[PDB]
């Protein structure tokens, strides 16, 4: 069994590979989520994952897809390394105290613990990454930062170190929703297939149940995700609170605006998780043998 150090290193590497592979999906989701906030005089409107990716590439370059990528990698190395490598230690701490099989509640609690700690640790990375992903020279809003470390230095010296933890509570909420929805939905669909005999217990049942659970988690966390992105991206003073941002999104843009960038979000969640899981298991076994 892999050591906790091997687990942390493997989770960090796997998360970094997944993040670098799926980063354009993240950029597309962010650009779709901040699209209707400020009206644009430009004719460049983003629609769909492919349309958004192509629009960004052709109006502002390939590299603008990977804007804030070092912040995303730092987010992996700290936040996701912790959240994925500590999950088994926490889950053993909970279930093995009484020699228990991992219940749904045990999984929910372990995931909530690891995800909350990871969110708090890596919020600065999330702030910098979102603000770099959302910034453009085309839509009349002046970019504030030239890069990841420039954004770090500017936010730290103009908004305070607390300004690097902006949007933590919406991010915590999104993490709670994603975790609970994914686990509950996965077990519910696994049973639903097993008792209505829709699929038997090879891999495809697990895989289809994972697909539905991921989509349901993305859909349930989409309103919080949109509000989080827009609140984190906003400069100080624009929104007096996170609920203030949500209320303005509701009154000025309607309910569907709470599902902006849902398709890129779901594609990133699914692809990121698949790539990360494959690389993580491979790294754990490949290191832990040698």
């Amino acid at each position, epitope marked *: 069994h892999p050591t906790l150090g091997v687990q942390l290193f493997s989770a960090g590497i796997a998360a970094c590979l997944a993040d670098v592979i799926t980063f354009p999906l993240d950029t597309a989701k962010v650009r779709l989520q901040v699209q209707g906030e*400020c*009206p644009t*005089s430009s004719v460049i409107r983003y629609k769909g994952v492919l349309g958004t990716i192509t629009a960004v590439v052709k109006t502002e370059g390939r590299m603008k897809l990977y804007s804030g990528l070092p912040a995303g990698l730092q987010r992996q190395i700290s936040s996701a390394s912790l959240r994925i490598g500590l999950y088994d230690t926490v889950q053993e701490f909970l279930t093995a105290g009484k020699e228990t099989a991992p219940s749904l509640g045990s999984k929910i609690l372990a995931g909530l613990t690891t995800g909350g700690v990871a969110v708090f640790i890596g919020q600065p990375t999330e702030v910098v990454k979102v603000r770099l992903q959302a910034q453009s020279h085309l839509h009349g809003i002046k970019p504030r930062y030239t890069g990841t470390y420039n954004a770090y230095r500017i936010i730290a010296t103009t908004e305070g170190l607390t300004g690097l933890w902006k949007g933590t509570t919406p991010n915590l909420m999104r993490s709670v929703i994603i975790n609970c929805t994914e686990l509950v939905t996965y077990d519910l669909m696994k049973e639903a297939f097993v008792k209505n005999n829709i699929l038997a217990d090879d891999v495809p049942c697990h895989l289809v149940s994972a697909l539905i659970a991921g989509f349901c988690a993305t859909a349930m966390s989409s309103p919080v995700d949109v509000v989080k992105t827009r609140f984190i991206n906003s400069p100080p003073g624009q929104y007096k609170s996170v609920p203030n941002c949500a209320m*303005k999104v509701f*009154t000025n843009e*309607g*309910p569907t605006a709470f599902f902006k960038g849902l398709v890129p979000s779901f594609l990133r969640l699914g692809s990121w998780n698949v790539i990360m899981f494959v690389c993580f298991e491979q790294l754990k076994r490949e290191l832990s043998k040698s």
Partner: nanobody
Amino acid sequence: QVQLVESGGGLVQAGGSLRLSCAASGFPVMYYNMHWYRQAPGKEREWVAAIESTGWWAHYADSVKGRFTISRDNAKNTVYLQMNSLKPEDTAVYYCNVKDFGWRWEAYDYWGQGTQVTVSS
């Protein structure tokens, strides 16, 4: 009970200035973007200006940008349109507008009665 009341319009010479007011009532103006439209007889209603919920951004039609500024005071529930360097082609009825989504497929427009602005030549 959304109610928009525009005032401050009148007859001014070309090159003159005029400040239009919009008293907004029956809704929490602090959550809504506010718009100014104008319509002259023989023309379609024309979007003029838009301002954010707390005035974070303001956008103008190209025909009015630099001459017209949109301003806000949510403590008074008032939206302002300062119109400088007025041209006879600015003669129109100016309308304050709220687009409300809430639980709606499309935004629904609320308008004032409009205030007439005539620019003399």
